[PDB]
Amino acid sequence: SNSVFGMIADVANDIGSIPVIGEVVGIVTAPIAIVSHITSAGLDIASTALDCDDIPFDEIKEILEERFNEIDRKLDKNTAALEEVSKLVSKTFVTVEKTRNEMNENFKLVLETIESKEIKSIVFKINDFKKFFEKERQRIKGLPKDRYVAKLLEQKGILGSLKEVREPSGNSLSSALNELLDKNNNYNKAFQALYALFYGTQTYAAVMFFLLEQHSYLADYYYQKGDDVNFNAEFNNVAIIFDDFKSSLTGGDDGLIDNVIEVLNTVKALPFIKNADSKLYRELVTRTKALETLKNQILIDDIPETLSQVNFPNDENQLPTPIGNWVDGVEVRYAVQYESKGMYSKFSEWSEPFTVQGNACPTIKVRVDPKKRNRLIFRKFNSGKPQFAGTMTHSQTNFKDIHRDLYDAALNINKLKAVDEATTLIEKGADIEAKFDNDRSAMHAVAYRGNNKIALRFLLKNQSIDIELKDKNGFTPLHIAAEAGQAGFVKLLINHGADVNAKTSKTNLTPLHLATRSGFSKTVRNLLESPNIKVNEKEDDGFTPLHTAVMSTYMVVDALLNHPDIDKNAQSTSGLTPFHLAIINESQEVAESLVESNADLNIQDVNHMAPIHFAASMGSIKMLRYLISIKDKVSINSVTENNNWTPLHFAIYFKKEDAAKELLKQDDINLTIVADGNLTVLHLAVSTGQINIIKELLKRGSNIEEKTGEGYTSLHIAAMRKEPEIAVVLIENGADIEARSADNLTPLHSAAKIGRKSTVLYLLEKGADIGAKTADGSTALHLAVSGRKMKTVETLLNKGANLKEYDNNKYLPIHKAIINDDLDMVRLFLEKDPSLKDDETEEGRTSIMLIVQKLLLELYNYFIN
Amino acid sequence: SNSVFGMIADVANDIGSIPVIGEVVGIVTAPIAIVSHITSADIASTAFDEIKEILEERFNEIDRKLDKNTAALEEVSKLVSKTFVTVEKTRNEMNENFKLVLETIESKEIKSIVFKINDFKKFFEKERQRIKGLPKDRYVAKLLEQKGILGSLKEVREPSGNSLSSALNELLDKNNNYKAFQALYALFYGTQTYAAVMFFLLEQHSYLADYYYQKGDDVNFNAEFNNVAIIFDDFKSSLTGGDDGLIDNVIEVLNTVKALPFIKNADSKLYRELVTRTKALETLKNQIPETLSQVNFPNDENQLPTPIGNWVDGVEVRYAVQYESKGMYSKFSEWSEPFTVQGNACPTIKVRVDPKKRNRLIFRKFNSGKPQFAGTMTHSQTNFKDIHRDLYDAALNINKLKAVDEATTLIEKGADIEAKFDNDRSAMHAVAYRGNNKIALRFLLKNQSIDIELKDKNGFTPLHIAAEAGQAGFVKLLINHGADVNAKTSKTNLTPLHLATRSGFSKTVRNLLESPNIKVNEKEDDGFTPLHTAVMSTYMVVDALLNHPDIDKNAQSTSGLTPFHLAIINESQEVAESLVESNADLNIQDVNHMAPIHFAASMGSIKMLRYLISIKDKVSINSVTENNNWTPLHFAIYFKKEDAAKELLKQDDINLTIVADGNLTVLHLAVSTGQINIIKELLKRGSNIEEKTGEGYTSLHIAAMRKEPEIAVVLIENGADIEARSADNLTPLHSAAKIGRKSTVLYLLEKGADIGAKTADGSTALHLAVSGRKMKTVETLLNKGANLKEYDNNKYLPIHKAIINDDLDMVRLFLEKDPSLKDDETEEGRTSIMLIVQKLLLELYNYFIN
């Protein structure tokens, strides 16, 4: 179940939950655990042998936050769309890596032997190189941004020398080709070696890819607030990397073309004996030819210039004016570069930081460039700015830099100073609403910062822009201010109104839902009053605004509880009321407020669990006490509609054995609950192996013996429990030693199957009957000789107390051993068990039958005795 | 011996009472020397700076530790230190047999690599021991540059591991084949060494980060946290992860050779408990970004921009916030976002960006290192940080009128004092540490219940801060309330009187003594009194305590330290005179049973020595003790304080008739020293030349058994007998022979010593010479006391020992070179033959028969 449930966890990883940020670590871990439990539902005993029952219970969470951090390592919507390179290469990588996934077992099989030829040693060495690659690959993806780039900053050169592999075995492959020529001519070991050479080629190509995307991510990191200058260096490095890539690929693929030629030559010239292994080989030859044709699918335009190309000295409205943010004296770190058609070329050359008390109006000959490539300049002052000063389609005259200046003025936090900045800019009145950082940054940002009063009263011309203006992420200004609590400006916007139920472009959500977790009771009332918005709104994932409001736990939920016409209860995608979250989010005040508003609508989830069982699952001791203090909703003693389980069963089954003690100490608990298999919760505890609650229930007078419909008894469970103390524990409790199966399978037979000799000897001093026998008539001796457990059958022969007699079938236990044919045990049995094997059966024919049955070895002739 | 005093040093190191200035570095170094003397308290001994060097370096190591409530990662530091000690115990234990491995040399060719890893061990040990010797500044300075070398080493250990796995392959080969035991033991040594080195590196980096916390660079704090995380992850992958670390290989080798049907040495069993330790260690080892982007408070009311110097006008802002208060304190850097902010201090701090179940503490900064702290609470907070910050800032200022202005303004602006800062209650106790005008007490007067009982991080009350600050006026201003003058702090519970004595603000302690109503008689940690702290203070302030209260002037401590001895150590003659005038001399013999003159000799303070001489009152210059009746003169004898020794010699009542244990007198001590000039001065004074001992030894008995002859020349100038018998009748010739100094016997015989002396046993000088078997001694005997051929009751002739001791040339001198001419030397002359035949003898013994 470890691998299969790990794959289920990887499926949950591919879900990518955190974009809909409603996943608390608890509310993502505990549901995953219960999902695993439900998918592995059903009860037995073989699981309870520590085979597949509870092997993982917590460390799966490790992979869970793995999934989360690999998810969030993705670029936070990098303003440049240059990530299409990484996207393409990852798409190519997925298929090749799956093919390598099958080739993994293929070439674990390919390990059939070593040194059929001397080249096979080199094959093994390059195999070890591959396994080095695979070992290094796993650790890479885990770490978050800072640690990720830290690990990046050293292994890149190692990988570069790995592609230019320290031992360029290609000529060794060519020599292997020359040898396998004759090797295939003679008839194959070289037949087995073609798989190896092809696998090496695949690993080669995969390593080239891996280098490529790691470089691409490094470039991305240096792009978004990274090393600005080193972005250009890294891009040139990856360009040269691609050049050497292509050239060495042409050479290696000339070799591979020779390989294909000789493969066809062998196919035609060979006799008609081959391997279907080579048939899958030829299918992958087709695949590799496709990937070979794939190779053809793939700043100078930007930076042969400086800023002083065409200086604009001065004129009206742009005279040198001392303005705070536009400081007079600090550098002018100009930088113009390319982006268009998704393609992006970014340079970093602030070659002219020349400072004057003048104006930045000069033009840089943008209008004359013949190439139809869109350009963009960004002019830092003293350090790496957000890098989006001015986007010019065909011309820049500082006007878009002026737009950025207005944008920055909108980022001020001083109110009257912001008004003064607004006056200064409206002297010229640059184009508001211009998009920066791929965001409709002007109006959204001014709404975020505030002073929406002045912005509205000066620029109230387009309410549609005020409402349905969406950014790179597809964000309305309402969503912009949702988590930012511009309550007064919420009145400002609602005065002319806005889309109450606007949905963002990706992971469609109300701005209300965005504001739900902000805990802004002073802001939410505005939407709560004016339009009477749909309180029962469900996003792309069916979580109520109430659900998304349980996060804050503040008085916002209390205001929302009852004042409007609310869906006081609902059902989530997996069947989760806000009461479920309140139980799990551990906000006791909100739980009490909800109890005040309405009674507990203890509706079960999709897999038939009420919020009661979660507390037993995670030992929610404080809420456990509070819910007992409710004194009502006695569903703590109810059952799962799925399979009739109380929360006590889950508490015992998760080893969280404190809330169980609490519940036991609460009141007169009903332990007579029966579930799938008629297994008492006592039997479940016996399987788990917790003596404390065991004797605790014993004090509460729990019924020791209620035979289950599964055929087992708690005595058998103890006989198979690896903790031999529990059987004795039940012994002083007075548990009947004859707590046997309906099939009369005593736990002696169980232990004979198990091999737990200590519990065997236990039952020996306890004097369990040895002359007894189960339904087929077989004493536990027969089961043991079927299983052939050495020390167990030794103790048996010590205390067999049986005459080695015929069962329902005429076999003696020695005949059972004969059928087993355990030659060492057969010889052990022949004499130490007194032989007397003359006329044992009718004329002693049983042995004679075993002669005349078939061709029998002379070993049996010796065993005749 | 030396290790015993090292253990005593360690015990002294453990307790923080000596870091408490109630005992000072000199004041603790001196008792170490005297305790070394006491534990040291003959004959063979006749034939200390390093101790105090060890003490001072260990106290420096204690000083290297950081302050209380300083930084984070402290649980990691503590646990890693604990397991580091645990590992180092076993490593030190196993080092001995690791060395013993290096004797079965070259049964294997990889023994060169074994020597290589041994040299690796030597390098590591030298570096790590060289680390633990420097003060904090030198400590961090040394760690700085070589942190890179240490990090390099962290991987440069790789060929050790690779060659070690290869060696373990060959070792499984060897053990399953049968000398591999030593190599497997070296395997274990490599494993333990790797683990220990890694833990050492982690602990060192942790402490370095902790130091960087104290106004260093938070960016550097993130860098160091990243480094420690990466190193621990390297550990995990290398030795615990899915990749099979060497521990898996060693466990499988143990299991495989466990099935070996062979009988093997106890080395395997010891390695088995070693592997038990390894798997226990294996089980042990196998287990925020947000910003006030927009929300500046608008003028709801009372923002009222004031030109506050504290909240500087025109500067920018910086900020970050991290989680603390339970276990770890994950740390983060977000100063990319801070930018210019002016107008009035009104940032709506907005904790609620991710209002999770964590206590996130924002620390606020600007251009340089800043106060960098603002409040703590889960839910919404509304910029009371500004007001509280300026509040403790006013409490911290030194311009009292400005403090008045700020206190008047900000309280009206709206906040509460009770909220802490820097985890301190600085807005309330910086008041005591800087003094306060009336309005501080006026504002605090409303409750009369906040500041008085206000425990700090260390639990101090304003009593303690005021007492150390010595702000006597503000001391009265507060004690108008009259709180617990006995407010003992949480750690190192003491009285504010102790603090005042330590500081030296006499006005404050006079004010305390004006209306104490206190138990001034407090006895602190080591049985001391506040009078002892005053003695440390070395000022006339002690007079106020001396006169008015009723303290025990004759106060003795746990170690036997009187205030007299403390003054002697400190050497303030004015204070000593004041103490003498106060009450009686506490010249009582202490726990070690010493006298103040003993310390006067110990430090060699001739100033205080002469002052005590001029006292003449109870100045028991010839006082002896219960333990061996040591005199201060005796201590001056041992410590070779020759100047003070002769100085006191220039006085009258210098008792030359001192009898110690076994009658080892002052002249005997002078002999045992070797300072000849002092002995000559003593003889000029005229002590008993032939002062004897319990074993009937004159001073020349021991002077002879020395390594220089000129001392015997001085004694014979004095006129000591050259044939003075002993209890064993060991004449000076006998003593001179029993050591092996030929020149001593030479000068004895120049004066006419009796060569023919022979003890009751019959041990003639020839017998002693052959007993020492020295060729020079025996040839001198043959020169003078040639051959008496004596024996015991069992007739052991000199030739009998001469042939037992197996020396060739001397036997030839007896029989061939200068023949003894004695054939048939014994009864029928076959006692020699009797010894030839008695039992098993030597292959080469045939010539020794002669």
Author numbering:
A (entry chain B): 50 to 236, 245 to 355, 362 to 928
B (entry chain A): 50 to 90, 93 to 98, 106 to 236, 246 to 354, 366 to 928
Direct quotes from the study:
As expected, mature δ-LIT was toxic for our insect cell cultures and therefore, we expressed, purified, and subjected to cryoEM analysis the precursor uncleaved inactive toxin. In particular, reference-free 2D classifications revealed approximately 45% monomers, 50% dimers, 2.5% trimers and 2.5% tetramers. Interestingly, such particle populations of oligomers were not observed in negative-stain EM, indicating that the interactions are rather weak and dilution of the sample which is necessary for negative-stain EM, as well as the low pH of the stain might induce dissociation of the oligomers. We were finally able to obtain a map of the δ-LIT dimer at 4.6 Å average resolution from 81,192 particles, with no symmetry imposed. Based on the structure of α-LCT monomer, we were able to build a molecular model of the δ-LIT dimer, including residues 50–928 for both protomers. As expected, the structure of the protomer of δ-LIT is very similar to that of α-LCT (sequence identity 39%), showing the characteristic G-shaped architecture and domain organization. δ-LIT displays however a shorter repetitive C-terminal AR-domain, containing only 15 ARs instead of 22 in α-LCT. The δ-LIT dimer is formed with the two protomers rotated 90 degrees relative to each other and the plug domain of protomer A plugging from the side into a cleft formed by ARs 1-6 of protomer B. The plug-domain has a hemispherical architecture matching the cleft formed by the 1st–6th ARs of the AR-domain, suggesting an induced fit and shape complementarity as the basis for the interaction. Besides the main interaction between the plug-domain of protomer A and ARs 1–6 of protomer B, there is a less pronounced interaction between the helical bundle domains of both protomers, involving H9 of protomer A and H6/H7a of protomer B. Whereas H9 is interrupted in protomer A and in the structure of α-LCT by a short loop in its middle, in protomer B (thus most probably upon dimer formation), this loop folds helically to straighten and complete H9. In comparison to the compact conformation of the truncated α-LCT monomer, full-length precursor δ-LIT (both in the monomer and dimer state) shows a different, rather extended conformation and a larger distance between the helical bundle- and the AR-domain.
